[PDB]
Amino acid sequence: NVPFWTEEHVRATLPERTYGTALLLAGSDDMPGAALLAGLGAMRSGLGKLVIGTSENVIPLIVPVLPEATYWRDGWKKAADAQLEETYRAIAIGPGLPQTESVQQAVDHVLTADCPVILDAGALAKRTYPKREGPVILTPHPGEFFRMTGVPVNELQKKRAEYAKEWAAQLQTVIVLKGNQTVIAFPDGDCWLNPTGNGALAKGGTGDTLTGMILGMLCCHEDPKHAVLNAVYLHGACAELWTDEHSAHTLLAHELSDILPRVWKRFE
Template identity: 65%
Template structure:
């Protein structure tokens, strides 16, 4: 197998690893997730990620977002609970609840507050998803739980110091190399997304298409990763299944509609029917 050839996380693998929802379960069975996302100017990122999480098996979702964003999001996502100005509170170390998983970054910009919040979040003993403004040059060797980075090629270029052209030429080998180097799982987004784990395991995702080349689809994926980490027992399977189903929703879209027309929130609306097709 050459450096750029990878095993594929197929529909059959997803079917075999999706969790069952027990008849005697309750919301606590599937955990509480924390999403730190959105700004005054980009409140929609918190909503898109929130939709993705709520559709992906989570028991309860807490969205930490600016107070100005809360009244905009609540009417369309009343199922979540809200932590006003959660990013600033997290940066001050005010994370008190126990979370099954945490995601931070959608809609955020790199800043001192964001970095402080990331450092506090990384001290928590649960899986952490870092996206968008939470991605920076760091290493993660001391965490016991999974750390998942979700860069597109430009963000991966910034993290590694490599050119985007180099990244695109050697996506698989570089994702695998840097996952081991950083001590983090890397979800390198793009055509045939590559998922590389720090232990050297690496997979190619077969789903997805050009309809995902639009703002907000990455926010939705971050939310789906958060939700899947809450309802899966196996962290690797959670990441792989989230990426696969995210792409499968996009594939469903283009069966009857142009890839030009997808809106990111429609991925979450398609997920219930797509997921059902994967259940045994």
């Protein structure tokens, strides 16, 4: 069946430490937290610089915790009106964003850039993608996969790998289908199962940190496929480290980012 992306694979593909500038389009007035979670995840993951295109009111909520980030005021809204005039190593859009047509407009404009693009949360919708050199990485939860494909959650959960591989090929996008054993399906037919992680991840916010982690690693890995696989793996590994001395019921998403420094070290 589908092979696991093992510690062996992680150790052989992680980069040895410019590291690129990433753009994170995330966070809105009622879902501001996602921008901080994704921002922390991204900056913890090897990038050189991070520009956060978030709503004006969200900026002040990020600064005290992540003073290393800089901003593109109302970036995700502005992205809906015109193509980006700045060059980025990788872009992520969706965490904390509403499921609206305006967000989809921003997605269309972002896709014209020459770099890997991650779509998550609010940026995930039933649609098709334009031919481009950079990979498009979708990170849906089962419910969002249903929104994207029409495949019922109850049906999807019975054949996760098959459906993920099926749609990654049909859409020609990378698909990180989250769950107990996250499936990573690539457009070229490659597919893997993530072996790390536990129920501590089944709580709001962990997906936002993952999106940030993928964004950051896309900036330090020469191979985007390895960046995605290693991000999903390390994200789960942080949750496993947490449960050694803490109850899986008590993890807060932002703590995965606090743990990554030591976990990553182990794989070097």
